[PDB]
Enzyme design. Structure first.
Site, mmCIF file in Angstrom:
data_model
loop_
_atom_site.group_PDB
_atom_site.id
_atom_site.type_symbol
_atom_site.label_atom_id
_atom_site.label_comp_id
_atom_site.label_asym_id
_atom_site.label_seq_id
_atom_site.Cartn_x
_atom_site.Cartn_y
_atom_site.Cartn_z
ATOM 1 N N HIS B 41 69.388 63.550 54.137
ATOM 2 C CA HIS B 41 68.365 62.501 54.063
ATOM 3 C C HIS B 41 67.604 62.480 52.710
ATOM 4 C CE1 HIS B 41 64.645 64.770 54.828
ATOM 5 N NE2 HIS B 41 65.251 65.421 55.818
ATOM 6 N N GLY B 143 57.576 67.978 52.717
ATOM 7 C CA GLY B 143 58.174 68.677 51.586
ATOM 8 C C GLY B 143 58.909 69.953 51.939
ATOM 9 N N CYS B 145 61.413 70.197 54.072
ATOM 10 C CA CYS B 145 62.815 69.923 54.412
ATOM 11 C C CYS B 145 63.759 70.728 53.534
ATOM 12 C CB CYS B 145 63.111 68.432 54.317
ATOM 13 S SG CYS B 145 62.264 67.433 55.564
HETATM 14 O O1 LIG Z 1 60.587 64.600 59.662
HETATM 15 C C1 LIG Z 1 60.244 64.266 58.533
HETATM 16 N N1 LIG Z 1 59.234 64.867 57.860
HETATM 17 C C2 LIG Z 1 58.721 66.172 57.974
HETATM 18 C C3 LIG Z 1 59.438 67.290 58.407
HETATM 19 N N2 LIG Z 1 58.906 68.453 58.800
HETATM 20 C C4 LIG Z 1 57.588 68.548 58.804
HETATM 21 C C5 LIG Z 1 56.717 67.507 58.410
HETATM 22 C C6 LIG Z 1 55.309 67.594 58.519
HETATM 23 C C7 LIG Z 1 54.515 66.545 58.164
HETATM 24 C C8 LIG Z 1 55.096 65.399 57.675
HETATM 25 F F1 LIG Z 1 54.282 64.405 57.227
HETATM 26 C C9 LIG Z 1 56.436 65.231 57.561
HETATM 27 C C10 LIG Z 1 57.296 66.294 57.945
HETATM 28 C C11 LIG Z 1 60.854 63.054 57.823
HETATM 29 C C12 LIG Z 1 59.841 61.909 57.677
HETATM 30 C C13 LIG Z 1 59.562 61.304 59.029
HETATM 31 O O2 LIG Z 1 60.751 60.749 59.632
HETATM 32 C C14 LIG Z 1 61.910 61.481 59.507
HETATM 33 C C15 LIG Z 1 62.977 61.036 60.271
HETATM 34 C C16 LIG Z 1 64.203 61.666 60.163
HETATM 35 C C17 LIG Z 1 64.340 62.733 59.301
HETATM 36 CL CL1 LIG Z 1 65.848 63.605 59.256
HETATM 37 C C18 LIG Z 1 63.289 63.178 58.524
HETATM 38 C C19 LIG Z 1 62.043 62.563 58.627
#
Ligand SMILES: O=C(Nc1cncc2ccc(F)cc12)[C@@H]1CCOc2ccc(Cl)cc21
Lengths: 305, 300
Positions: B41, B143, B145
C-alpha cells in the site's frame, strides 16, 4: 492506537554484552571502550559470599584469572580495579560497537529497559520501574548478574542499572554503573528484606492520561481536589506523595487531554476508595504504575532511536 | 524468579530497518540481503484507498519512484516486484547487518516481539500475541506501517509479521513476510471489522503453570475435569477451545509442577467462576493470555 509496555530498542546495548568468568562463577559484563564493567561478586567463592572482603579477594587476583569473552573471541584483561560494588576490567581492545553513552543514577519511579543476558548473550528485553523501595520487579534466573538497565536519549544510551541479586521475595536488587546500590542492600549472602512497596502516583496518573488519549474515559469525573487533600488519600492507600514537580511534569498531558492534573487526581482518589467495579483501563484491572509521564508522551507521539 | 512480559532483543532487527518513500507516503521497510520488503500500500494515492488495483499501480512505477533510506544513505532501487500484499524492492547493496533469518507464518495464540518504527527508525520494542481473531493488540501510530514482528530463537531471526493497518477498534492487522494477511483482511480502506476476540486458553494455562513455578498456589484446587466439560465452561467465558494438542503441549509444565493439565483446567474453571477476590496472580488481576507454553518454559 494501543498502549503497550515498551522497552527501548536494545541493539546499542547488545553490542556491549560480554561474558566474564572468574573461577567457577560466570556472569555478564558491559564492555564500553577498553573497560568491562561487572558485579564485583564475580570474585566470590561459597565462604566468600557469606562475609566478603572484596579489597582482599581482588588483591589476590591477577589479570589472567578473569576470562572475558566477547562473542567467540577472548579479550585479554590488562588491569582490574573496583569502584564500589562494580569490578572494572581494563581490556586491550576498545569495543568497536561502543555507543554514545552516559552513566546515570535514576530515582524511584523512573523506568528503564533491562537487557537480560546469560553467558554474555542477550536473551530478552523488558521494561520496568525502580520501585519506591529501590527494588525492581524483574525476571532473572541464575547467571543473569551483570545484565543492565538503560534508557535512550536521542542517540545516547544512559546506563542506569546493573543486576547483582534476587531478594527472598523474588524481587531484584542492583547498583548504578558506579557500583552504588539502589536501596539499603549489600552484595552479600545475608538476611536482607525489601521494605514495603508503594505505588508510583505520578506514573499511575500518566497511565490514566494514556488511557484517555486511547479513548478510555469511564473513570473521569466532574471533580477536582487539592494536592493537600489528594496526598492524604495517597498516604492512606500506600501511594507515593505527589509533589508540585509531578503536577508540573504532567502538564503537557493535562493540556493535550483537557483534564487538569488535580481533576485526574480526583478520578484516582475515587478509583482508590471505590475500585474498578468489574471495569478495566487499557485492558488492565489494576492501576499501572510503570509508565512515567515521559514514557506516555514518547509512546503517544512516536519518538524514535 | 520473577515473571515479566519479555520481548526478544531487537538489535538483529534494528540493523534491517529502512525508510521507504513512494510519492507522498513514507513507511518502514525490512532490508534483508539486497531486498527491501514493505507493505504494497506504499504505492497508493488518495484515489487508491477503497479499491486499489496494485498490479496496475505497480506497473506504472519505475525504480526511481521509490526512495529507500538506510540511516542517512539513500539506497538505489534496481527492481520491484510484488508478492501478495508485500512489495519487494531489489537494491544495489546487500545489508551488511543481515542476520541469519527465516520467514515463518504463525498461528493464533503464538507470540512475537514487535519493533515499532517510524521513518525507518526503531522507537520501541514490545511483546504481542496473534489473537484468535487474527488481529494483534499493538501500539502503533501513523507511519508505523512496515514495522515487523519476530522471534529470535537461537541465533536466527524468524520474521512472522509486517504491520499494514489499524482496524476501527484500534486493533492491528498485517501479513506474514510473504504478504499473506493474517485473517479475513484486505489492504483496502473498505469497511472491515475484526471478529469477536477470545482468550487464548492454552496460554492462560501456561501462565498459571508459570505462577505455580513462581510460588503462587492460592488458585489451585483438588478438582480435575474432563476435557469436554472444561471446554463447555470455557466457551461460555469467550475462551478458545482447548484441544488435545494443547493438553500435550502443556505436558512438560504439568510434569515440572506435578499438577496435571486437566487439574489445572479445573483451577481455571474456578477462577472464571469466582474471579480473583482482590488477589493477583504474578502481579496481575486478570488472567494473562500472551505467554505461550514455549515462552513460560523459556523464561522459567
Ligand atoms: O491503517 C492505516 N493506518 C495506520 C496503521 N496503523 C496504525 C495507525 C494509527 C493511526 C493512524 F492514523 C493510522 C494508522 C492506513 C490508513 C487508514 O486506512 C488504511 C486502510 C488499509 C490499509 Cl492496508 C492501511 C490503512
Amino acid at each position: 492506537s494501543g498502549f503497550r509496555k515498551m522497552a527501548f530498542p536494545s541493539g546499542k546495548v547488545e553490542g556491549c554484552m560480554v561474558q566474564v568468568t572468574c573461577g567457577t562463577t560466570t556472569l555478564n559484563g558491559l564492555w564500553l571502550d577498553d573497560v568491562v564493567y561487572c558485579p564485583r561478586h564475580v570474585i566470590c567463592t561459597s565462604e566468600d559470599m557469606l562475609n566478603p572482603n572484596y579489597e582482599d579477594l581482588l588483591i589476590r587476583k591477577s589479570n589472567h584469572n578473569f576470562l572475558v569473552q566477547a562473542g567467540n573471541v577472548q579479550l585479554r584483561v590488562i588491569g582490574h580495579s573496583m569502584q564500589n560494588c562494580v569490578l572494572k576490567l581494563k581490556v586491550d581492545t576498545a569495543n568497536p560497537k561502543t555507543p554514545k553513552y552516559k552513566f546515570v543514577r535514576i530515582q524511584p519511579g523512573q523506568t528503564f529497559s533491562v537487557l537480560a543476558c546469560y553467558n554474555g548473550s542477550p536473551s530478552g528485553v523488558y521494561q520496568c520501574a525502580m520501585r519506591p523501595n529501590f527494588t525492581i520487579k524483574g525476571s532473572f534466573l541464575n547467571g543473569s548478574c551483570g545484565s543492565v538497565g538503560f534508557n535512550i536519549d536521542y542517540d545516547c544510551v544512559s546506563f542506569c542499572y546493573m543486576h547483582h541479586m534476587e531478594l527472598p521475595t523474588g524481587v531484584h536488587a542492583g547498583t548504578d554503573l558506579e557500583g552504588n546500590f539502589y536501596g539499603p542492600f549489600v552484595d552479600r549472602q545475608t538476611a536482607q528484606a525489601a521494605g514495603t512497596d508503594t505505588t508510583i502516583t505520578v506514573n499511575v496518573l500518566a497511565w490514566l492520561y494514556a488511557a484517555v488519549i486511547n479513548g478510555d474515559r469511564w473513570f473521569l469525573n466532574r471533580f477536582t481536589t487539592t494536592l493537600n487533600d489528594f496526598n492524604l488519600v495517597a498516604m492512606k492507600y500506600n501511594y507515593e506523595p505527589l509533589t508540585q514537580d509531578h503536577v508540573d511534569i504532567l502538564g503537557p498531558l493535562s493540556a493535550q487531554t483537557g483534564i487538569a492534573v488535580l481533576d485526574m487526581c480526583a478520578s484516582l482518589k475515587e478509583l482508590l476508595q471505590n475500585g474498578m467495579n468489574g471495569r478495566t483501563i487499557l485492558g488492565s484491572a489494576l492501576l499501572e504504575d510503570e509508565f512515567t509521564p515521559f514514557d506516555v508522551v514518547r509512546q503517544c507521539s512516536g519518538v524514535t532511536f
